């Protein structure tokens, strides 16, 4: 599990925890200040124990190698501007089903929508995760034009 920050934002991509570690996961997650976790890939576990511990879990998927709707970008973008101004110092965890999968793509958007060019964000990310953004994803981010309503 890796982490990346920028301005008021600090994310944490992770690995789809098995039911076999959920108890430990929560402990890890809480040691980072993670308050929310977006699952963008198949859901493989209960959330009651998590939600039990003040950690909401939003479920907004989309097929890897596929642009995350238009709605999903809104919410993500909002969520990111809100949660961070609202909970100073908190982390937001995004996780996929396999491993990184498409999780970086979001974070990227978070960075792009924050005044970073897509490459500036791809590099900034591949700094933590050796290999991410398969050919297709690199295109999506490249084409992506920002709304840019993120105050800092």
């Amino acid at each position: 599990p890796v982490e990346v920050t920028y301005k008021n934002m600090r994310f944490l991509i992770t690995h789809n925890p098995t039911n076999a570690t959920l108890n430990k996961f929560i402990e890890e997650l809480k040691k980072y200040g993670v308050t929310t976790i977006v699952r963008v890939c198949e859901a493989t576990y209960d959330t009651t124990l998590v939600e039990k511990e003040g950690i909401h879990v939003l479920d907004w998927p989309f097929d890897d190698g596929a642009p995350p709707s238009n709605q999903i970008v809104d919410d993500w973008l909002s969520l990111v501007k809100i949660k961070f101004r609202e909970e100073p110092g908190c982390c937001i965890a995004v996780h996929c089903v396999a491993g990184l999968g498409r999780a970086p793509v979001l974070v990227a958007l978070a960075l792009i929508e924050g005044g970073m060019k897509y490459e500036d964000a791809v590099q900034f990310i591949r700094q933590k995760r050796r290999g991410a953004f398969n050919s297709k994803q690199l295109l999506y981010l490249e084409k992506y034009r920002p709304k840019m309503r993120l105050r800092f």
């Binding site: 859901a43 576990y45 209960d46 959330t47 009651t48 939600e51 909401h56 879990v57 939003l58 479920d59 907004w60 709605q71 919410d75």
Partner: peptide
């Protein structure tokens, strides 16, 4: 009797 509910859209 628990599963993963929450979320919104």
């Amino acid at each position: 009797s628990l599963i993963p509910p929450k979320y919104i859209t």
